[PDB]
Design a protein around this nucleic acid. Sequence first.
RNA 1: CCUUCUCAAACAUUCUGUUUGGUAGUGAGUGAUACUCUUUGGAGUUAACUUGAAAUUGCCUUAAA
Lengths: 125, 284, 50, 256, 150, 247
Amino acid sequence: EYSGIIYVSRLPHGFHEKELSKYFAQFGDLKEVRLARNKKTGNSRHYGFLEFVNKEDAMIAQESMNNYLLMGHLLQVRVLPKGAKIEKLYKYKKRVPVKQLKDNMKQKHEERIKKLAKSGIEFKW
Amino acid sequence: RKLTRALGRGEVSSAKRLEENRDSYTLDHIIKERYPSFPDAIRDIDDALNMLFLFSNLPSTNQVSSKIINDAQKICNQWLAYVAKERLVRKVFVSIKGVYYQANIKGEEVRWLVPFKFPENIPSDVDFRIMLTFLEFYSTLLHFVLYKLYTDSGLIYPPKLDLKKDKIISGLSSYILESRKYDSPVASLFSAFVFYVSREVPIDILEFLILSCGGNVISEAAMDQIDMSKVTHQIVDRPVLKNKVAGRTYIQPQWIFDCINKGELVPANKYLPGEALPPHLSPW
Amino acid sequence: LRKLKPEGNLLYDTVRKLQSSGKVETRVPVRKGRKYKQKITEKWTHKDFK
Amino acid sequence: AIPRERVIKAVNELIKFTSKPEEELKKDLQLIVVNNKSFTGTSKSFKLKLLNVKHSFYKPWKEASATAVKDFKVLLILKDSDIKKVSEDDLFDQLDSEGIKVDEIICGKDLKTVYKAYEARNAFISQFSLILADDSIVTSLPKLMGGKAYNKVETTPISIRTHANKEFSLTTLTNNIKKVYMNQLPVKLPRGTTLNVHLGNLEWLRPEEFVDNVELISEQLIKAYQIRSIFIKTNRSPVLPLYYNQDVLDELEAKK
Amino acid sequence: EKKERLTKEAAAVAEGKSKQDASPKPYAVKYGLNHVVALIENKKAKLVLIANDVDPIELVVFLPALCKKMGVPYAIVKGKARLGTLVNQKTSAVAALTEVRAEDEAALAKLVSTIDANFADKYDEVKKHWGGGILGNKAQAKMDKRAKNS
Amino acid sequence: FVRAESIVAKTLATSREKERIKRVSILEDKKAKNETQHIASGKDFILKITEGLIREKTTYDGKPALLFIVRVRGPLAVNIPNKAFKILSLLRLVETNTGVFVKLTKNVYPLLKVIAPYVVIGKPSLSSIRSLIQKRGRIIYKGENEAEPHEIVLNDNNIVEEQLGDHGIICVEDIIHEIATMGESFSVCNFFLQPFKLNREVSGFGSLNRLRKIKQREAESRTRQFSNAATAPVIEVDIDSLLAKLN
RNA sequence: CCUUCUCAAACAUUCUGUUUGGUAGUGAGUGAUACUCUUUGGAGUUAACUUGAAAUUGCCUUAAA
């Protein structure tokens, strides 16, 4: 038999933790919610997780929204076995001397030149 | 019902088709059988004109359908332009509830109101659709009788109105007259006069009187968007007045009221405010 | 005359003229009213969706 | 500037290198790269810097895709008011004479209606290699067509002076498209310091024309962005220094 | 719309001299029952719709079986006037879709993927179950009190 | 219940509004800072839409003038942003189909540019303002009574004396001249006037008037353009013809 | 169940030329060529290739009722 945790999928844009919380409050008191945001130019990879409190709340929500529709994604949803222990996905926003390095440039210029020379593709300079 | 069926089923092109393809009702046969025709009509138009000039002033909201209002305003101004161009007013009496008039139009002397142009407030205790229906009947009535009037005078009925005038004043300069002596003496009083009215006083009742008693006019407020060449008179109801000039007498409208109400053309001696007034000297 | 505040509601007064001159009966516009409950209950379909 | 004989022997060196050791298609197309001081940071522009060139390679490209299967070809996307104004008869009068041909004409309402279905969107546009869009539209596009087009420079859009100020008529653009086809080419500018450019391919025009073309763009780029150093490869090879400027290197911490 | 199309195309064929194809192609549902069932067994449908509420049910019972056989994604809509709303008839009792403008190809293709999600597994349980085994409240309370006492 | 489709469309609409308001606000910030190397176009523009319709674009080069505006509902999903809630709460245009006048300038132009999708705009005529103020208009007034859950229609110019005699102002006709000719500073009047509660042009929900609602929505979504370009012109109409319906 | 930053200047007229600036994205991944930084922490830049928008875990009031 299952756990209260749920897996969801195929989310569209504009659908965030606030939307999940306010929507799925209706199917009972929600314990905690979390979705999948990118850690780079932070936007969703269109899935998430939730447990409202209960196994029965989870399964009735799944029975309702198993193949639910909106514009041209459609939500699929999975009740899990016991536990399954949401652990991760901290929320991520959109993350935002001269002569010494000149000698470094000057020497590694020669280094790349000898590297292409010993490939071997011969070169002056 | 058909339209409702249509809009439930969609079919909005068909709904427009239904609405354009209908022929609503008219009341010409009702009038021209109920009133035989002319003297009775002009006798009993008074209660019509009262409610019309009321509805032209009161505000638009639900229960109003302000197309109604602009129609009533149009026929009101048509009526006023006809009677003022043909120079018939016989009494005037200012009061708190607007002003009553009196005119010997083709025999019987019709008395009627034109209220003050101000934002009255509504009870929401009166029942309205009855009064609207009254108005629709009266509007049709006046449309018929006024067509008859313009025609028997001989005139281009109904009057066009130039938008550049309508957008500045929306007055009696609008609804311009095109054809196809007088009441002797009280027509053509102020003959060859010019009144520069101050902005301070409301033209809403000055201009019917002034144009009935023939004389040209210019307003202060009229030139807000855009000469005093031959101006003869100045009018104001302000305590202080400046820079007053010698070309004009600086007078009050009770002068006009007494002048037409007695047909005497009293001087402007008891005038040039802020001296007090000969109080109203009502006709009754 | 700028001082002049008009007074008296022409709606009330002309309606008095209407009721006075024997054209119309004296009346309220009075708003809605029901005698019985017009009972609510649930459709068959919502009742048996199980 | 670069020694032109160094440029000559460099291109000879590249072609004789790649002459002998999908694979050749991946490994033959020429790329040219440049480092600069630093590019415009925290500002993701998507315009393309248009260089002037004397010999374009798109005529070889159509000549090569006539044999190959990819069918190198053009796109042209317009404002909504314009497809009714324009037709294929006019370009049939104009462009076949000087010897090219447009493939189709299309609008943005069609972009947002029939080139949704993102699969079908990318499948549609990946057929196209060369993209021409309006100055008016270029800002609006990336909400419409999406970054799959913009990562690749083939798909990535470009403005064009369409509107003869005002009340656009065709000829002011029909000559401009001839100019940008035959005598100008794009350049992209990413974040950071590095900038690669898909110059062309080795089966297209000879080294004797490629050499003065690269000389042209290099001399107009050294003045443009205060570039750091210049290299080349074809799609695996290590970087070939043909201009390594050092007076440009000393002002970097002077900026600080 | 037809008569506007005709008064267009009469001038179009009189002056422009087309083949009566100057006007464009239509893209529309196809709504006669015999039309539908003829198109099926040519497999010229991508979605058909079926109305539950038909008392002459013999008209309709063969359709889901036949659509299953020909592998076409049937669907039983609730309401026949609902289907008439989109043909401009009172009742149609079916509608179909065979050819679409490109801008809803994904819409249709995904709609099919919803429909078979709603039906393909439900087909096993619809047929093994004889509906309508239900009693009224008095008999129900009778047997409930009997089970309670026993 | 809360219509999940409506939830997500609401989120998208408010996010799009957030994008465009931030866009134009920071645009105007860098305009005022005058570092104008990277801006698409450095000047205002004015589209005077008139009557498939007739379009005329122009620039301000103020030459200041006045305008009259109305809150219209929309667009169509949005839970509002603070960065227009504060503005229109100051301007007293919420509880919509409400009218207020305004004096135009460069301080206030971009405020029109942000509020524009929520609102309809155009200049009035002398007849139109005269009709408006003689038919409509209200006052908050205090003394000897009346702890102000209060409203008063204009019927007394002695109120204009006792509240604007300090300005040397009586005579709401004289107020109207001040307004129409842009006389002495326009601002006691704007802060005072208790702005106009106009009427919805069509009540209905009979099968007839529903049709007029649909035609009305066709007309407004035709004439208005929520282009959100951040360089697009302002929109201006025949208000003289419109408030004939709306008054 | 919305629907997308769909033009601005300068010049001299060529209805047409030069320059100017104007976009921060569906995501998932596939392997892979080179450049900066600074301390290992790799952050950012660099060829092209698939996927039905795919998927399980990377500190305001009439748009009401």
